[PDB]
Design a protein around this ligand. Structure first.
Ligand SMILES: [Zn+2]
Length: 145
């Protein structure tokens, strides 16, 4: 009826690239965290091809993609469902998966996008922010809201 209005505040990002707290014991986040409703399709930011597909006990489901120059990598943690297989070519704006609260103990879902160069792992990560900064629809080149 009359009452429905949103308790909105700020943008959808939980955490960007950097340390969790002061002191050296709470380490670095190597990605970007888009808070999403469960079942939202994740879109390809760039044209590329799938390298690896696997499921982690604490990070949930994981998709790995490679860019067309072959040096840059793209991780996608906290998926409900895949829309591609290993060895599929993709094109920017195409659905590659759907995000869901997999790995997460109680909290709502967030797409963890992790951007890497020369290989894949924490040390290979660069920064996702300046990459999204040039995309056709920005962060909406990665999700369907
Ligand atoms: Zn994250």
């Amino acid at each position: 009826g009359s009452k429905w209005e949103d308790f909105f505040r700020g943008s959808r990002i939980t955490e960007t690239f950097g340390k969790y707290q002061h002191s050296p014991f709470d380490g670095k986040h190597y990605g970007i965290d888009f808070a999403l409703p469960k079942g939202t399709p994740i879109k390809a930011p760039t044209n590329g091809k799938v390298t690896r597909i696997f499921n982690n006990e604490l990070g949930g489901k994981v998709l790995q993609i490679a860019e067309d120059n072959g040096e840059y990598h793209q991780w996608y943690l906290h998926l409900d469902k895949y829309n591609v297989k290993v060895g599929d070519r993709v094109k920017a704006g195409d659905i590659i998966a759907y995000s869901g609260n997999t790995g997460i103990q109680t909290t709502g879902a967030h797409l963890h996008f992790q951007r890497m160069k020369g290989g894949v792992g924490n040390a290979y990560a660069e920064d996702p922010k300046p990459f999204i900064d040039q995309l056709p629809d920005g962060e909406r080149s990665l999700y369907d809201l």
